[PDB]
Amino acid sequence: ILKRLFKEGSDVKAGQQLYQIDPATYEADYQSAQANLASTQEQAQRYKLLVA
Amino acid sequence: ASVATAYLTLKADQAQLQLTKDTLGTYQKSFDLTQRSYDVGVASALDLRQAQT
């Protein structure tokens, strides 16, 4: 846990974040997925514009 | 015999001319598609130069 964000004993809205568990080994999967998304959008866009 | 061979070579060579005009049409369509794919970005400029040759 990097940070506790809620004030203790306070009313909590549905959807408010509470903690921040370490996003280290998960931001490195988001970049690995976002890179392949940025490469495979280009196949779809190039071929969608080029099938015409 | 010579007039007959001249007329037969004339007919056959204008048929050859028609087939080379049709091959020119197909090569022009293939270069049109390679120039289309070159603008978008799929084909590199090497395939564009090969289609142009």
**HEC letters along B8-42:** HHHHHHHHHHHHHHHHHHHHHHHHHHHHHHHHHCC
Q: In chain B, whose CA is at the least distance from the CA of A46?
A: B40
Q: Say which experimental method was used.
A: cryo-EM
Report whether A1 contacts A21 (CB < 8 A): yes
With contact defined as beta carbons under 8 Å apart, do B48 and B35 qualify?
yes
Chain B residues whose beta carbon lies within 8 Å of the beta carbon of residue A47: 42
Chain A CB contacts of B43 under 8 Å are: none
Q: Which residues contact A24 (CB under 8 A, 6 or more apart)?
A: none
Stated in angstroms to one decimal place, the resolution of this structure is 3.6
Q: Which two tokens stand for residue A36?
A: 């392949």
B52 close to B35: Cβ distance less than 8 angstroms: no
Is the backbone of residue A15 left (phi > 0), alpha (psi -120 to 50) or beta? left
Instruction: Name the residue with tokens 């056959």.
Output: B12
Instruction: At A14, list the tokens.
Output: 């549905």
